[PDB]
Amino acid sequence: IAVGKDAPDFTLQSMDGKEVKLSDFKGKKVYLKFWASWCGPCKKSMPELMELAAKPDRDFEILTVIAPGIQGEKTVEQFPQWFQEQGYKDIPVLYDTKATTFQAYQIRSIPTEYLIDSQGKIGKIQFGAISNADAEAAFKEMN
Ligand SMILES: C[N+](C)(C)CCOP(=O)([O-])OCCCc1ccccc1
């Protein structure tokens, strides 16, 4: 994994039971956030991400990834209940049930965001939360 190189492919079930592939988003920039329900700064960054999702006419898609049941994350049954109770919605959550997407993207800390360009290359990486302003600006400087 490296800035400027292809973002690793993945095929994951969403919280809502749909299969989602990075390749589904060819030609769209992607905001890809790895997080966990047990992580304070991850929770704290979610309402701001809902703000971003609510903005019309974005040339990027938002996708987030958790590893359900892994290293303390909530079970697949418990997670959606918790998510809804926080008031969270309109944010895709993909289930990395094998931890292989976290592994593929070499996650060391959370939250981590990969901002992937329209050509499927990693454009930016941010350790910790990124402001919506900074994310929007970043996507403007990417292909
Ligand atoms: C606070 N509790 C102990 C759950 C969270 C920290 O757990 P920990 O054992 O101290 O750190 C490893 C988690 C890193 C990770 C993330 C996602 C998938 C695979 C590995």
Residue numbers in the entry: 43 to 185
Paper lines:
In addition, the molecular interplay of the surface-exposed TlpA (renamed Etrx1) with its extracellular paralogue Etrx2 on oxidative stress resistance and virulence are unknown. The bioinformatic analysis of pneumococcal genomes identified two genes encoding surface-exposed thioredoxin-like lipoproteins, renamed here Etrx1 and Etrx2. Surface-exposed Etrx1 and Etrx2 deliver electrons to the SpMsrAB2 protein for the reduction of MsrA2 (by Etrx1 or Etrx2) and MsrB2 (by Etrx2) domains.
The three-dimensional structure of Etrx2 in complex with Cyclofos-3™ comprises the sequence from Ile43 to Asn185. Four molecules were found in the asymmetric unit presenting a similar structure (rmsd value of 0.184 Å for all Cα atoms). Etrx2 presents also a modified thioredoxin-like fold that is highly reminiscent of Etrx1 (rmsd value of 1.5 Å for 130 Cα atoms), where the classical thioredoxin-like motif of Etrx2 is embellished by a central αβ insertion and an N-terminal β-hairpin. The CXXC motif (81CGPC84) defines the active site. The main differences between Etrx1 and Etrx2 structures are the presence of eight extra residues forming a coil at the C-terminus of Etrx2, the conformation of β4–α3 loop, the disposition of α3 helix and the more extended conformation of the β7 strand in Etrx2. The ligand, found in the four monomers of the asymmetric unit, is stabilized in a pocket formed by the β4–α3 loop, the α4 helix, the α4–β3 loop and the CXXC region. In the structure of the oxidized forms of Etrx2, a detergent molecule (Cyclofos-3™) or a HED molecule is bound to this hydrophobic pocket, very likely mimicking the redox partner interaction.
